[PDB]
Amino acid sequence: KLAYSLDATASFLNFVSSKKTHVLETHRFDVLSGGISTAGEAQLVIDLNSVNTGIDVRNGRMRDYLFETATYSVATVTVPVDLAAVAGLAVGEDMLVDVSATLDLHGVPGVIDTQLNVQRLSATRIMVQNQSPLLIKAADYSLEAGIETLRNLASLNVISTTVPVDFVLFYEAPH
Numbered sequence: 001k002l003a004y005s006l007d008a009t010a011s012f013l014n015f016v017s018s019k020k021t022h023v024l025e026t027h028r029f030d031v032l033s034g035g036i037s038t039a040g041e042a043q044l045v046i047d048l049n050s051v052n053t054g055i056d057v058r059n060g061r062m063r064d065y066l067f068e069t070a071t072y073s074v075a076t077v078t079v080p081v082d083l084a085a086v087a088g089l090a091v092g093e094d095m096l097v098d099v100s101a102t103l104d105l106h107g108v109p110g111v112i113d114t115q116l117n118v119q120r121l122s123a124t125r126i127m128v129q130n131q132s133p134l135l136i137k138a139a140d141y142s143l144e145a146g147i148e149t150l151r152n153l154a155s156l157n158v159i160s161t162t163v164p165v166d167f168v169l170f171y172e173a174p175h
């Protein structure tokens with residue numbers, strides 16, 4: 001079934017908000033899962049209820065009014081992968097992989113065309129990370145209404161609708 005499992009505790013995915021005059025804050029999802037099937041389909045499942053902004057009231061507002069987690073508990077990324085290309089990586093070697101990754105977020109699947117860095121760490125372990133800075137536009141996933149609700153709740157003049165995302169994921173073959 002699975003050629004690789006996500007090492008959930010070693011892996012992270014962060015996103016960055018900006019409010020007011022460039023007050024940047026990096027937030028995280030504390031719970032990720034995933035794997036790569038023997039049919040060559042890599043998946044990352046992001047637990048939207050695990051959002052961590054450092055502020056409990058804010059976290060609650062993001063769950064309820066932004067992601068609407070009672071409807072959308074998770075966001076799922078799916079990426080076809082060449083398992084032979086990954087297998088052929090020497091220990092320590094990297095490769096760039098151009099992907100059309102599907103992101104299912106907030107009830108709107110969309111494609112992220114980006115480049116990933118894949119590096120082999122051991123006979124069983126690989127590290128996968130965004131090669132380049134990666135931006136998500138809220139409006140692409142019908143999240144701009146959510147951001148406006150957050151802005152109003154916090155009495156802010158402006159919150160940016162463009163959100164950088166960074167991740168470092170570790171996938172492990174069966175040992």
Ligand SMILES: COC1=C(OC)C(=O)C(C/C=C(\C)CC/C=C(\C)CC/C=C(\C)CC/C=C(\C)CC/C=C(\C)CC/C=C(\C)CC/C=C(\C)CCC=C(C)C)=C(C)C1=O
Nearest residue numbers: 015017019042043044057058077079101138150154163165
């Ligand atoms: C009381 O406290 C409060 C405040 O502070 C005092 C506030 O500021 C505020 C105001 C609030 C804010 C400033 C926060 C506003 C929040 C904003 C702007 C964020 C909006 C978020 C978004 C638009 C999106 C969030 C991002 C995600 C869900 C991540 C999506 C995931 C992405 C893009 C990753 C895609 C993955 C890939 C391309 C590949 C993944 C790799 C694989 C599958 C492996 C492949 C394998 C191989 C081998 C190649 C409130 C309400 C408050 O209550």
